[PDB]
Amino acid sequence: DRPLWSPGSEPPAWLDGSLAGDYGFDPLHLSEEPEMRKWMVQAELVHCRWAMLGVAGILFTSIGAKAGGNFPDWYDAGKELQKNSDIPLGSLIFTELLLFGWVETKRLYDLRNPGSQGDGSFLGITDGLKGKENGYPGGLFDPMGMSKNEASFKEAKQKEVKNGRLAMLAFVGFIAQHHATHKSPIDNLLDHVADPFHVTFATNGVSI
Amino acid sequence: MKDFTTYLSTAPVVGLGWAIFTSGLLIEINRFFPDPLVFSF
Amino acid sequence: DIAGLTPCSESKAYNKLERKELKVLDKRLKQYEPGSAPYLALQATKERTENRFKTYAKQGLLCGNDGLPHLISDPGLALRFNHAGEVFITFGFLYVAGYIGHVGRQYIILSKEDAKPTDKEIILDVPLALKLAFQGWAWPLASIQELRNGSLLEKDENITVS
Amino acid sequence: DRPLWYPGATPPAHLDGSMLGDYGFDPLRLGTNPDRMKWFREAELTNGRWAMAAVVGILFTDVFTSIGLVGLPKWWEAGAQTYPIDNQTLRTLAIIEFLLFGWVETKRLYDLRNPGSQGDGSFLGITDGLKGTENGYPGGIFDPLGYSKTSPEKLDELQNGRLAMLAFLGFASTAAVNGQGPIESLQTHLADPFHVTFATNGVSIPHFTEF
Amino acid sequence: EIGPKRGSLVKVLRPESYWYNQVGKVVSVDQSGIRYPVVVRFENQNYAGVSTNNYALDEIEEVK
Numbered sequence: 081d082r083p084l085w086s087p088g089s090e091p092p093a094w095l096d097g098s099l100a101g102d103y104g105f106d107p108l109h110l111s112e113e114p115e116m117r118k119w120m121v122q123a124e125l126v127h128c129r130w131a132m133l134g135v136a137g138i139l140f141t142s143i144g145a146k147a148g149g150n151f152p153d154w155y156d157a158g159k160e161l162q163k164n165s166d167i168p169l170g171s172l173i174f175t176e177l178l179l180f181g182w183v184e185t186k187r188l189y190d191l192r193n194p195g196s197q198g199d200g201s202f203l204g205i206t207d208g209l210k211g212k213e214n215g216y217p218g219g220l221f222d223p224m225g226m227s228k229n230e231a232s233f234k235e236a237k238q239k240e241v242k243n244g245r246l247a248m249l250a251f252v253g254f255i256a257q258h259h260a261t262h263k264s265p266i267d268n269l270l271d272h273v274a275d276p277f278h279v280t281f282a283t284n285g286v287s288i
Numbered sequence: 289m290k291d292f293t294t295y296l297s298t299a300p301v302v303g304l305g306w307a308i309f310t311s312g313l314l315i316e317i318n319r320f321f322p323d324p325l326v327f328s329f
Numbered sequence: 330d331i332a333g334l335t336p337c338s339e340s341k342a343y344n345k346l347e348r349k350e351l352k353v354l355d356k357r358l359k360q361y362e363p364g365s366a367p368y369l370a371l372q373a374t375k376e377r378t379e380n381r382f383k384t385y386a387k388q389g390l391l392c393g394n395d396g397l398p399h400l401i402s403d404p405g406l407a408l409r410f411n412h413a414g415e416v417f418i419t420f421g422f423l424y425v426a427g428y429i430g431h432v433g434r435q436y437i438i439l440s441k442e443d444a445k446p447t448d449k450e451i452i453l454d455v456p457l458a459l460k461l462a463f464q465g466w467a468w469p470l471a472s473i474q475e476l477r478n479g480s481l482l483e484k485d486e487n488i489t490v491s
Numbered sequence: 492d493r494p495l496w497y498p499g500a501t502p503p504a505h506l507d508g509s510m511l512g513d514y515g516f517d518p519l520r521l522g523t524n525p526d527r528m529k530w531f532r533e534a535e536l537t538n539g540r541w542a543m544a545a546v547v548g549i550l551f552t553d554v555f556t557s558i559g560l561v562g563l564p565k566w567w568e569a570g571a572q573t574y575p576i577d578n579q580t581l582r583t584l585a586i587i588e589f590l591l592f593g594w595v596e597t598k599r600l601y602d603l604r605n606p607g608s609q610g611d612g613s614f615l616g617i618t619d620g621l622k623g624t625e626n627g628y629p630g631g632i633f634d635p636l637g638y639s640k641t642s643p644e645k646l647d648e649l650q651n652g653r654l655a656m657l658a659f660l661g662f663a664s665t666a667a668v669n670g671q672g673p674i675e676s677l678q679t680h681l682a683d684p685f686h687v688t689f690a691t692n693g694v695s696i697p698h699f700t701e702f
Numbered sequence: 703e704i705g706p707k708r709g710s711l712v713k714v715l716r717p718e719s720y721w722y723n724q725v726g727k728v729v730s731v732d733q734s735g736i737r738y739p740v741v742v743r744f745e746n747q748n749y750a751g752v753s754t755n756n757y758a759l760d761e762i763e764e765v766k
């Protein structure tokens with residue numbers, strides 16, 4: 081009744097197709113329990129969002145570096161951006177860790193206690209700060225009212241999962257082609273279209 | 289999955305969780321901090 | 330300079346031993362190239378030896394007639410002089426040992442209040458063990474509060490043959 | 492009673508009952524016993540009450556010291572400068588302090604075990620005025636501002652006391668990794684907020700990244 | 703009728719038994735005038751491996 085990850089196979093019992101981006105691919109039986117599934121879905125959503133932001137940033141700075149700007153490549157970016165900076169390391173590390181502790185702790189307690197942070201505790205915010213779904217918050221993180229329609233919200237959730245999976249699969253590819261060619265991803269893309277027959281993953285010495 | 293996580297609570301939880309944790313903790317302490325014969329007071 | 334000992338900072342045997350080890354380690358440096366992995370390993374071992382001798386010394390640690398550091402253990406005798414650090418800080422072991430004992434005793438009592446507490450011993454209740462492990466930081470307070478209430482012992486319910 | 496320390500999923504057991512400054516913070520479940528809870532609240536009250544006087548004695552004098560009104564030393568060496576003066580006793584302050592402090596500490600101790608146990612045949616003529624109202628809350632000691640009808644003033648007292656305790660711990664730790672005063676370490680934090688930080692100024696966490 | 707209530711936990715008072723000063727559940731009490739009619743059952747096994755034994759009426763005490 082739905083397209084599966086392996087045409088002809090049978091999906092598991094705990095994967096009916098009601099989840100966002102469900103395809104029936106789970107061979108190691110992970111997320112079989114309801115609580116484990118509740119944790120795994122949020123882990124996938126947070127990984128998809130962080131992967132989409134990181135891949136977009138890497139492509140942006142790489143395209144800007146190929147255009148002519150003073151942007152370093154995605155790899156070794158933190159090395160040459162810290163030598164000429166007034167923000168000290170350690171202090172910057174713990175500043176980032178301190179802000180992320182507050183945000184991630186509120187998000188974690190929202191998962192264990194669904195709809196709990198929106199009780200006027202954090203500076204008096206009752207309507208917002210309470211999630212609508214599992215890993216889909218609302219109220220403040222939805223400026224445009226695009227979540228108040230299930231017919232479009234379901235399709236938009238599907239688009240988010242299918243784009244995040246491709247983005248994280250692309251991020252894994254960023255490390256591999258960098259470690260195999262020592263060049264920028266936009267430099268590897270432009271070099272592949274310049275010679276699609278000669279240059280490829282098999283004519284670069286490494287990975288043979 | 290419930291049977292695998294309940295299998296992981298018999299002998300690994302006591303012989304490979306604690307043993308690996310305690311051994312790794314003492315070893316990393318003796319690796320980053322070299323040989324300690326006093327309270328360095 | 331107590332119990333007839335002398336500070337490790339003014340002992341000839343301490344320096345003699347230091348030079349002995351620095352020499353036996355340096356004798357192995359000639360058998361290798363000045364820029365390879367065995368040379369780097371021998372250099373790291375030499376640096377650790379020099380640091381250890383410097384760290385062991387100038388810290389109140391004193392040796393006696395052989396260059397080997399001796400340890401003062403009597404409280405009062407180790408408190409009147411700067412020797413409290415060498416062994417009088419027994420409270421570190423007492424804290425970790427009491428932590429282990431309190432966590433195990435809390436797991437035995439709580440697990441016994443359940444039907445058949447046996448299979449709970451061979452198959453640990455990991456969420457209960459992890460919760461009880463991070464809840465026993467203030468173990469001496471729980472021990473003194475569990476002693477005054479009489480909930481630490483039993484009156485006369487023991488398998489005895491006396 | 493008052494807002495929980497966390498927004499959710501943290502329900503305590505023995506914190507449901509009404510108490511001064513009740514925020515529901517007890518992760519180790521130390522105050523489960525009622526008698527131990529009743530003793531721990533008195534300990535918290537005494538610790539906060541003395542930490543408040545200590546933090547004001549340090550901070551209020553440090554304000555005038557950093558501005559330039561007085562020439563008094565800082566708190567970490569105020570002891571090393573009191574006794575070198577010509578008119579200052581030897582180390583007998585500790586003994587007279589122990590004796591004169593134990594005398595009233597035992598009165599406060601016997602009052603907790605038996606509340607209001609100050610019979611007529613104990614003192615000279617003020618043997619009746621030492622009858623406290625509650626444990627840790629006496630009446631004849633304080634003269635004004637206490638015949639009101641609403642008790643949440645004690646919440647301000649407990650909140651100020653908790654903030655004072657945390658402040659003294661910061662005084663002892665900041666002056667242990669930098670060797671300066673509290674306002675001396677505060678004034679430098681206003682100049683360079685990213686350089687003088689516990690993660691990188693003092694040797695607090697081992698950060699060795701000097702590439 | 704003469705022994706304790708069936709199903710009630712009791713305490714053994716035999717000074718030479720493996721369950722001395724222990725607590726055991728009474729399974730049945732015989733009414734034939736035998737020497738040891740109160741039959742009890744304990745959670746923990748003895749050195750031999752059995753877990754039940756029968757005691758008399760005088761060597762059976764109520765729990766605490």
Ligand code: CLA
Binds near residue numbers: 303451
């Ligand atoms: C040869 C006889 C014999 C045998 C086979 C046993 C066997 C056992 N005894 Mg026993 N005992 C004996 C004689 C014996 N005893 C005698 C003579 C006495 C004196 C009368 C006792 C008194 C005694 C007591 C008081 C207790 C036992 C307990 C136990 C059980 C211990 C289970 C365990 O691994 O502990 C546990 C070992 C651990 C290391 C637990 C720590 C778990 C950590 C905190 C979990 C964290 C790991 C983490 C999740 C992993 C992440 C790591 C990652 C970073 C890689 C075990 C089945 C204990 C029990 O009941 O089990 C609970 C118990 O408390 N015995």
Ligand code: CLA
Binds near residue numbers: 665676680687
């Ligand atoms: C509310 C009390 C308080 C305040 C206002 C400060 C303020 C300051 N501290 Mg300090 N500190 C405190 C408590 C406090 N501390 C406690 C309890 C400890 C013991 C763990 C320390 C240990 C400490 C060290 C070792 C160092 C500082 C340093 C500093 C200065 C730079 C900030 C920093 O590096 O991170 C601060 C480090 C902390 C551990 C504080 C963070 C956690 C606290 C306890 C939370 C309390 C904050 C409160 C809820 C909200 C602010 C209240 C305020 C508006 C009144 C800064 C002016 C550094 C310095 O002097 O720069 C050279 C430094 O090296 N602090």
Ligand code: CLA
Binds near residue numbers: 252261271
């Ligand atoms: C996310 C999709 C994606 C895309 C669009 C690209 C694209 C590209 N890769 Mg790459 N790669 C990827 C994933 C991807 N890769 C992953 C996951 C890995 C880790 C195994 C690698 C490892 C890798 C290496 C080592 C190299 C490249 C190289 C290249 C460039 C030349 C083509 C080639 O020979 O690659 C080889 C093809 C593969 C390794 C197959 C990967 C297929 C994955 C699973 C994605 C498939 C999903 C989907 C069907 C494709 C995208 C759809 C659409 C956008 C086209 C090219 C622009 C080469 C280069 O740097 O150019 C000089 C190079 O040497 N890739």
Ligand code: CLA
Binds near residue numbers: 303
């Ligand atoms: C490679 C095969 C292998 C090996 C080497 C062992 C070895 C062991 N088993 Mg295991 N077992 C196996 C297969 C194996 N088993 C399989 C296939 C199953 C079925 C799933 C089990 C099920 C099983 C159960 C249910 C239990 C054991 C227990 C034990 C331990 C004996 C009790 C003891 O040491 O005294 C007892 C020790 C004390 C009372 C003092 C407590 C402090 C201890 C020493 C700390 C624990 C550290 C650990 C024992 C050392 C490292 C373990 C090692 C495997 C790396 C022992 C080390 C018992 C156990 O868990 O140990 C407690 C026990 O309860 N085994």
Ligand code: CLA
Binds near residue numbers: 429430431433436
């Ligand atoms: C946490 C459980 C626990 C606790 C609280 C105690 C407590 C005690 N034991 Mg004991 N013991 C235990 C486990 C425990 N034991 C086990 C597993 C064994 C079998 C190896 C023994 C064998 C033993 C002997 C032979 C003797 C004692 C004795 C004593 C008493 C003297 C103090 C001491 O440290 O002796 C020493 C204790 C040991 C050498 C055991 C150390 C092994 C570790 C700590 C046990 C592992 C416990 C486990 C991690 C708990 C699980 C945690 C949970 C969250 C899953 C003391 C009340 C002595 C006594 O008779 O009383 C005066 C004595 O002679 N014990």
Ligand SMILES: CC(/C=C/C=C(C)/C=C/[C@@]12O[C@]1(C)C[C@@H](O)CC2(C)C)=C\C=C\C=C(C)\C=C\C=C(C)\C=C\[C@@]12O[C@]1(C)C[C@@H](O)CC2(C)C
Binds near residue numbers: 107130133134137153
């Ligand atoms: C791919 C990935 C996960 C892949 C997981 C897979 C396939 C799991 C598959 C299965 O589990 C199923 C489904 C079912 C199971 O039964 C079986 C298996 C088979 C196990 C995660 C990537 C996840 C990737 C993430 C989250 C990446 C984030 C990147 C960030 C944040 C970037 C930061 C940057 O820093 C850099 C790196 C460089 C700087 O120059 C620039 C900035 C931008 C600063």
